[PDB]
Amino acid sequence: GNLSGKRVDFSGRTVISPDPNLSIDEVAVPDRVAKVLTYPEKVTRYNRHKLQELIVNGPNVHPGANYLLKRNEDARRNLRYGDRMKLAKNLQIGDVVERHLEDGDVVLFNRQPSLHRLSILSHYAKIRPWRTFRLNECVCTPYNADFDGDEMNLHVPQTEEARAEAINLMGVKNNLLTPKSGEPIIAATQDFITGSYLISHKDSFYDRATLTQLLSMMSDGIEHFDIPPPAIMKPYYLWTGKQVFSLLIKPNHNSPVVINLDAKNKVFVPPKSKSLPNEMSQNDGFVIIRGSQILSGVMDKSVLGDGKKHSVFYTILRDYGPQEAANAMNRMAKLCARFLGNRGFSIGINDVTPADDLKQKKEEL
């Protein structure tokens, strides 16, 4: 008899959709539910210029408002039945309007089987087309999202003090670790791993007809990059694939990001059992990063994304704050989604058939 109980105003429940073109601290809200979920704003010296136009635009145009509350409490004046743009002209300094949900508003976001404290995070809003609560996929792992038509809940705080607590000690950028073990739980995911193994594979050598496009796809145009001198020269000017992840950690001299970790990845081969460096392996294996420069190893699940204490974004988080780790996660999440669609990756029936020798060893053994 310890069931759900309470009924809370100003909430919605809608299905979820994929979107890695969105930042990790943002959930895109459609304009059909960001028209009835209002936010009460008191008018002051610093919002009189905006709230007049906001009242004039009305309840049907999206940058608008639905209700109005007078200072001496006349009534709760709705902006639908009469009382046109002259009502925005008086606007006494204690009036409370109920504006629409706009871009940048703090909103908390939930999934109904709440297991632990990473099931209720808090995001920024963004007003979009078609009617679904789409979100990024680096942030869907703490919600345990496996999308397939699942629904999620959305609540807006209605005061100035609870809105400050959702974004400071409850927001996404301040909760990059699970408290169960200290490991990062909210990091890179499925298609962001195989899009990183194919760039940082050793058989990848790029060119300025490709490398420039690779740097432009990860920062949607506007970012100043310093192109390093190439790893291959005078026969063919060729840039390796490990100089792309070396560049998205630290684009230019203006970013202070210096990363100096080294740890082994997933499935690993001992080099010769005599070579004292751990990175002389038969495969790529052991990863060296010295001064935001990858010297060896691929970017798989262990090094890049969810897992142990030796991640890259964990190092950016401990050394250079949460905002830079969020920027690097956004940059790789909108690099991989553009690259892997234009490289090509498929499975088929050809990659599962035994080639008539396993059919001999299976009959033998």
Partner: protein, 335 residues
């Protein structure tokens, strides 16, 4: 970088065109309009009324993909837009039946129409040089001279199957003499839109405007606009015999040739190859064949919907891709 490309049994390399000044130390291959005028040329395989096949050599994948991309959307065409219904008492719903009138192709020049301004009221957007009006009016009637047995709905029913030929164009407004030389008909009149029974009737009127293929699929002037790179089979270690005849039976029959009363095999008419790399899994033919395709050659193939000739669509696409380049250089850059 390392020309005509390699087809491998598990991958394909040499994808990027990379002919820019900065691939190597020597600044090779600048823009040089007089060099591109010398290198580029066009062959033509065939020209039909609704099908065109032609070839472009020495040209990038980028600005030849651009032509393929804006053959579909940016070249405008006309289609049925607004359908007004009277007494639709058939079995097909009036959203389904209106969706099928939009998808029939119309045979008229889209240069005789002007774009609709979407800021005017509903009684002022549609004028004489803007709208093509069609009318369907079919009532089904039982045939009194019925045969000896009930066999098919074609017999014993007057006009139970409507067709695209029953969309009659109406001379609208004032300019009824401009379309008197070429009245608009559907491109193929045998389109089964509905089936009727006696007692049923369809009476409607359709307004047809101009649109691009990026807004909706029905305005796309071309059915299939695509290309293919020219394949190539470099056969070294020229060995002959029974294995050369097994080499023939893999491929399509008219793409390599055994010499009749003479020496070993060769390659004739490599244009007809659909590359399936079926000779790269044998272990008999390992260092004796080399599949590939030349990156600079393109075989443009266009089959239009029926509105216009397919040799006009390519010229209009080159004109459209030119006109959006000079429109951008004559605009001021606002900070």
């Amino acid at each position: 970088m390392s020309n005509i490309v390699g087809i491998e049994y598990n991958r394909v390399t040499n994808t990027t065109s990379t002919d820019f000044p900065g691939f190597s130390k020597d600044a090779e291959n600048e823009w040089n309009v007089e060099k591109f005028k010398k290198d580029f040329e066009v062959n033509i395989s065939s020209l039909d009324a609704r099908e065109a096949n032609f070839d472009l050599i020495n040209i990038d994948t980028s600005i030849a993909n651009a032509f393929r991309r804006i053959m579909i959307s940016e070249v405008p065409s006309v289609a049925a837009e607004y359908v007004y219904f009277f007494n639709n008492t058939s079995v097909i719903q009036d959203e389904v039946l209106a969706h099928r009138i939009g998808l029939v192709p119309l045979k008229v020049d889209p240069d005789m129409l002007t774009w609709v301004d979407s800021n005017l009221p509903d009684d002022e957007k549609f004028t004489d040089e803007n709208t093509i009006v069609l009318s369907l009016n079919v009532k089904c009637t039982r045939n009194p001279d019925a045969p000896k047995g009930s066999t098919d709905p074609k017999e014993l029913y007057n006009n139970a199957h409507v067709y695209a030929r029953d969309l009659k164009f109406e001379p609208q407004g004032r300019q009824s003499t401009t379309f008197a030389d070429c009245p608009v008909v559907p491109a193929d009149p045998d389109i089964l839109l509905a089936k009727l029974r006696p007692g049923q009737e369809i009476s409607l009127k359709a307004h047809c405007i101009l649109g691009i293929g990026g807004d909706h699929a029905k305005f796309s002037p071309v059915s299939t606009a695509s290309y293919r790179l020219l394949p190539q089979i470099n056969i070294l270690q020229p060995i002959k015999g029974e294995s050369a005849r097994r080499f023939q039976k893999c491929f399509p029959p008219g793409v390599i040739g055994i010499d009749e009363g003479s020496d070993e095999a060769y390659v004739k008419d490599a244009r007809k190859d659909t590359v399936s790399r079926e000779v790269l899994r044998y272990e008999e033919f390992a260092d004796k064949v080399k599949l590939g395709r030349v990156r600079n050659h393109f075989i443009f193939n266009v089959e239009s919907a029926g509105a216009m000739t397919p040799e006009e669509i390519f010229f209009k696409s080159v004109r459209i891709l030119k006109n959006k380049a000079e429109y951008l250089k004559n605009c001021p850059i606002t900070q």
